Amino acid sequence: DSRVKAMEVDEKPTETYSDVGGLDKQIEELVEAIVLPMKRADKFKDMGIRAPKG
């Protein structure tokens, strides 16, 4: 459908997670939840854990 094709990436410029003042710990947990079970999907498969759905 045409609403979903617009929702698709358009490359929004990053603001960078280092320019977001304070809140050090919140960046790590977010990185733990979304970014690292995509890239390192071998170490979840050796261990035998599932990836957090969201």
Next chain:
Amino acid sequence: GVKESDTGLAPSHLWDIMGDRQRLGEEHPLQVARCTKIIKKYVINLKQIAKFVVGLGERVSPTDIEEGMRVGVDRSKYNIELPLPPRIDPSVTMMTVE
């Protein structure tokens, strides 16, 4: 009665020379449609619900055709003639502007 009073008046007689050779042209109608998918050819969805694959016109740039944009297509064998601006939901939003 209204005794036969129809807008136009005194300049519309010179318009009758210009507007009779264009009125017979198929310039109009272009059945207005709307794109649902650009497949890197183009997929339009008519507003009657019946889906067709159409293609480029007389000389339109391939940048004009965008997602969710309306376009006018040839009345008979469907082919994009002239793209048209987007969304026909704006109209309850143009009467709010003072």
